[PDB]
Amino acid sequence: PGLFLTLEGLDGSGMTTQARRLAAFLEAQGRPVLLTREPGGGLPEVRSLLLTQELSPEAEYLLFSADRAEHVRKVILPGLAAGKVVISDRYLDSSLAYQGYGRGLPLPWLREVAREATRGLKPRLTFLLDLPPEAALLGLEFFRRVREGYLALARAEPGRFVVLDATLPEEEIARAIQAHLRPLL
Amino acid sequence: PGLFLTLEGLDGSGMTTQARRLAAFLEAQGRPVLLTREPGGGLPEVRSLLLTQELSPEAEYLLFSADRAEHVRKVILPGLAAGKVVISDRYLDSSLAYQGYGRGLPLPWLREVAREATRGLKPRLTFLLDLPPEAAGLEFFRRVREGYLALARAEPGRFVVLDATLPEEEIARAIQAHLRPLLP
């Protein structure tokens, strides 16, 4: 059957740690799991470029989208087809937050592009690890737009987003995530 | 105000040669010219990623679009703003023909992606060098070749369809003939 779960938030919100703890939880339960991430899960070279290059928001988004399109087709959908729980550390909501709310691109266009890039694939649950930019493990105005952008996305889809306080101890966050996930297993 | 011109067609149709000769002709008319190309005129690294093995048509198109977005923004629009004739060896019609007609991606999606990527910028004229597909698998090239001709049928004022098998000098003179009413 397969279950698709994502993690989202600012860099340093503990997403990689929590994706690893979630994967381990599922391993403990005997449930096959695939852990993956964006950018780079589709086209690793995109990650390397976005690291080095200054690009227009449109070009940045379109590169992210290409990576995502490959990621969905070659990694995520085949994992789900095998009945795995697939966890992605970042997915489309990251582009919406950073390129949309952060860099100002219009959301309906972002979503139209994404419609064919993702083959319409949506996470069943998305865990947003919310904190102020100053708490992540001026220049801050961008990151505040992104943080508020994520909160905006979450309030628009309360049936998909679970918003957690990312400044809580690591173990407590993991237990909150497990609690939210248990009904879906 | 500038003038935006493109060349299109199958690879080996002589597009690069015609782009070059066109730039020369225009400079001889005292017109400043910017000669550019896709892929690579926006993000030269897109050429490596484009060769990625078994790349999905969607990913391929999105890669071309990223380069195209940077190309329009950083090269072509600033060129036009400076009053240059900008000639691009390939532009959006390349994606529509190859990724749309060839690889089967839906045209309306290709266009909606392109709307922001290109900021609606369209060439005044596009010279389509129509080449037999066996000269460019063959089934793919036949779709692409025919796809281009469909595009040209659909926008008959913008497209100038030329026989790629004619001598270079004849093609160049035909391009020159279509351009004279846009020059003083």
Curated annotation (Swiss-Prot), chain A:
It catalyses: dTMP + ATP = dTDP + ADP. GO terms for cellular component: cytosol. InterPro entries: P-loop_NTPase, Thymidylate_kin-like_dom, Thymidylate_kin_CS, Thymidylate_kinase. Keywords: ATP-binding, Kinase, Nucleotide biosynthesis, Nucleotide-binding, Transferase. Its EC number is 2.7.4.9. The keyword Calcium does not apply. GO terms for molecular function: ATP binding; dTMP kinase activity. One of its GO terms (biological process) is dTDP biosynthetic process. Disulfide bonds: none annotated. ATP binds at G9, L10, D11, G12, S13, G14, M15, T16. Belongs to the thymidylate kinase family. Phosphorylation of dTMP to form dTDP in both de novo and salvage pathways of dTTP synthesis. This is Thymidylate kinase. The gene is tmk.
